[PDB]
Amino acid sequence: VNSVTISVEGMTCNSCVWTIEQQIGKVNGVHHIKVSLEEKNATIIYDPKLQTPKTLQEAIDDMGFDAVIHNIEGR
Amino acid sequence: PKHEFSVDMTCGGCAEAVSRVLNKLGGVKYDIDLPNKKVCIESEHSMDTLLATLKKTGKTVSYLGLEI
Ligand SMILES: [Cu+2]
Ligand SMILES: [Cu+2]
Numbered sequence A: 001v002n003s004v005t006i007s008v009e010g011m012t013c014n015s016c017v018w019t020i021e022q023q024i025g026k027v028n029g030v031h032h033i034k035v036s037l038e039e040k041n042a043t044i045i046y047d048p049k050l051q052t053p054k055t056l057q058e059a060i061d062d063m064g065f066d067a068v069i070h071n072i073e074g075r
Numbered sequence B: 001p002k003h004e005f006s007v008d009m010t011c012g013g014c015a016e017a018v019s020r021v022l023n024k025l026g027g028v029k030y031d032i033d034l035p036n037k038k039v040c041i042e043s044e045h046s047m048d049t050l051l052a053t054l055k056k057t058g059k060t061v062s063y064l065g066l067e068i
């Protein structure tokens, strides 16, 4: 499993993080997601034969938050 | 045509997401009331797609009818 860091503009309060967190977590292949208001991003651990940094990016973008890929990490 | 939806909007950031999914569907002119948790869309798009657009927010939406 790999790790992507998508930066996210437009998170203001916790309802925002929660919303983003609780539905991108429902997504399959997503092992783990942790969204941060402070540096305004999400970190996702994920099963790579299920999702790609672009599929996860687009999932967030379709929610009305502007998501752009910052860091891919893996082996 | 002026349809009217209920969208649970907690924060101001929640309301910014509604105007984005709307702006990307295009061909709408909207006004989002954050206190009253309501959206009105004037659009030739079908009620069913305008509905479908607004639940991409993750927020529970619902159709109240027309104004118009
Ligand atoms: Cu918020
Ligand atoms: Cu919000």
Ligand SMILES: [Pt+2]
Residues within 6 Å of the ligand: A012, A013, A014, A015, B010, B011, B012, B013
């Ligand atoms: Pt808030």
Ligand SMILES: [Pt+2]
Residues within 6 Å of the ligand: B002, B031, B040, B041, B067
């Ligand atoms: Pt109106």
